[PDB]
Structures are given as structure tokens and as C-alpha cells.
Design a protein around this ligand. Structure first.
Ligand SMILES: CCOP(=O)(COc1ccc(C[C@H](NC(=O)O[C@H]2CO[C@H]3OCC[C@H]32)[C@H](O)CN(CC(CC)CC)S(=O)(=O)c2ccc(CO)cc2)cc1)OCC
Lengths: 99, 99
């Protein structure tokens, strides 16, 4: 589909057997999601943006479905104020910017 | 153009007569540039990111050309980690997400 940017580009995703809402975010290298107790091993990480850094847990090879499009890659989990789908997963669903 | 997302979507912009590099950021509501000299009045503003809030200088109705496409809109100037073009100007240049 085509998503205009008059409003935030929010979509439903499926991850860890749960449904959530997340932003399709071309400004995020990697995907960052709200606290969720995912199974498996993880590695600590710190990620920065406007305002400074937060602590997150890096999970690898996680399956996410985004508007019916399946993808598999790194998900960072922590106290983010917003769920963002980053380029690591947007590339996998064939997402481009167009103007 | 059609821009894929395997790399950061960085483009050249022109503002205040100066060229700069900026990131097309669908996750940003607003356009935030690193510290720079811009002519005209400005009002102090606060904006929040992943790590908290920062103070910016808000410049309204600023001419800015993004990858060959003109916009005139609000530009926030302050300690952002990187120059970002947000949705307030992405809509002006007709930018959509497509997959
Ligand atoms: C419930 C209330 O939430 P809130 O207001 C904040 O909500 C938010 C809404 C959207 C975002 C997404 C963020 N956009 C953003 O910063 O936009 C600013 C300007 O425009 C305003 O609109 C939205 C906020 C304001 C950007 O797209 C992505 N970022 C990187 C860019 C930073 C500019 C480039 C380095 S990153 O997220 O930092 C990030 C860093 C590392 C990694 C791992 O690779 C992944 C993601 C973040 C928080 O609370 C405040 C305390």
C-alpha cells in the first residue's frame, strides 16, 4: 500500500504471539519496542536519540509480521515511549520513500 | 525519487542559503536541525524524543529545499543528534511510504 504522512504512520504488528501498534520509522536504524517479556537470550544495549540514551535488551532473529508482511531480525526491547519499526525490518517488507 | 532503506535516507537540503545533509525521518512529527545560525525571530520550544525532552529554537515559515523540492514550514534548531526532516515537511514535498 501507500501511506501518506499527514498523520503518524502507525500500523499493527504481530510479535511474540501478541499484537501491537508501531510506527514505520525511516529515521530508526533498528526496531525498538515497548517492554515485553520475550523468551530467549538477549544482550544489553544503549540507544540514543533526542533527549539522550535509554537502556534496552537486544533480541536477535525475532519474527515480526507488519501489515501481513513477514520479517525476521533484531528487536530492541525497553522503556521506549513509542514503538518504532526501523530500517532493519522495513527493508525486509520492501518499504521505500517516494516523492 | 524512490529511496530504499538499506542505508540511512540522507539527502542534501538548502536552508538559509547553506547546504546541509539531513535524514528523512517518518518517525519525527517535526523537523529538527543541529545548532546553526538562521535569520529571523524565534520562540523557545520544548520537544521530546526517545530519551527525554530538549530545548529548541522554533523558526516558523522557513524556506527549505529538500532533495530538489521546496518547502516552507517550521524548523526546530537545537541539540538533536542528527539533522532530521520530519512529517511537517515530508508532506509538503509529497513524500509517502510504499511497500
Ligand atoms: C508518549 C510520548 O512520547 P514522547 O513525546 C517521544 O515520542 C517519540 C516519537 C517518535 C520517535 C522516533 C524518532 N523521532 C523523534 O525523535 O521525533 C521528535 C522530532 O519530531 C517529534 O515527533 C516525534 C518526537 C519528536 C525518530 O524517528 C527515531 N529516532 C532516531 C532519530 C532521532 C531524531 C535520528 C538519530 S529514535 O527514536 O531516537 C531511535 C534511536 C536509535 C534506534 C536504534 O537504531 C531506534 C530509534 C521517538 C520518541 O516523550 C518524550 C519524553
Amino acid at each position: 500500500p501507500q501511506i501518506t504522512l499527514w498523520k503518524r504512520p502507525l500500523v499493527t504488528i504481530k510479535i511474540g504471539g501478541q499484537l501491537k501498534e508501531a510506527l514505520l520509522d525511516t529515521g530508526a536504524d533498528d526496531t525498538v519496542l515497548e517492554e515485553m517479556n520475550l523468551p530467549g537470550r538477549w544482550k544489553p544495549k544503549m540507544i540514543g536519540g533526542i533527549g539522550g540514551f535509554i537502556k534496552v535488551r537486544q533480541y536477535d532473529q525475532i519474527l515480526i509480521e507488519i501489515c501481513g508482511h513477514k520479517a525476521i531480525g533484531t528487536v530492541l526491547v525497553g522503556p521506549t515511549p513509542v514503538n518504532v519499526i526501523g530500517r532493519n525490518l522495513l527493508t525486509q517488507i520492501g518499504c521505500t520513500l517516494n516523492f
